[PDB]
Design a binder for this molecule. Structure first.
Ligand SMILES: Nc1nc2c(ncn2[C@@H]2O[C@H](COP(=O)(O)OP(=O)(O)O)[C@@H](O)[C@H]2O)c(=O)[nH]1
Ligand SMILES: [Mg+2]
Length: 166
């Protein structure tokens, strides 16, 4: 049984928590108390090999924050969540994809830019924009929607596949 860390990072509201709890409790949550920071684990099987995945769903909390930075150095999988129907999450992934290079002090993490909130018609972020920003860094782009587990499997799976190959 291997152990991988899903270092999640994105805008506060894209649906990072609702995505984690979904794979765990299995239910759409509209308010999972944004004022809560804890590590959510999950034992599942990727492809004939069970592997404990310590999901790291950071929360809000302002002021001093040294535990979130320490996790950026310990975990390895980076699920850069970005709500396509928000736009601010996109600008949040631009800078969020620099501090990761700070912590590890290098540009070679199994990075993964996911676009949450892709189960609606209001598409403020066209796929061409996320394709020109993610493809530029050389990172895979996927879709996700906690409102129906749509894409949640393509993100978590492709994440363990990037850490294994590395
Ligand atoms: N339609 C839709 N709304 C979502 C989705 N994920 C989050 N939201 C909305 O965004 C808000 C924040 O969700 P939540 O996951 O609790 O916040 P987070 O912890 O910052 O991700 C909620 O009020 C939801 O209505 C999703 O997959 N689909
Ligand atoms: Mg939250």
């Amino acid at each position: 049984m291997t152990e991988y860390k899903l270092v999640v990072v994105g805008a506060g509201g894209v649906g990072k928590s609702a995505l984690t709890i979904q794979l765990i409790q299995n239910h759409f949550v509209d308010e999972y108390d944004p004022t809560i920071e804890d590590s959510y684990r999950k034992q599942v099987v990727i492809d004939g090999e069970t592997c404990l995945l310590d999901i790291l769903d950071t929360a809000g909390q302002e002021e001093y924050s040294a535990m979130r930075d320490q996790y950026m150095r310990t975990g390895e999988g980076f699920l850069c969540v970005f709500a396509i129907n928000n736009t601010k999450s996109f600008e949040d992934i631009h800078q969020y994809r620099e501090q990761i290079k700070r912590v590890k002090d290098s540009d070679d993490v199994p990075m993964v830019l996911v676009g949450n909130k892709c189960d609606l018609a209001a598409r403020t972020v066209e796929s061409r924009q996320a394709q020109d920003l993610a493809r530029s860094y050389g990172i895979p782009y996927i879709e996700t929607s906690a409102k129906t587990r749509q894409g949640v499997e393509d993100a978590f799976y492709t994440l363990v596949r990037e850490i294994r190959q590395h």
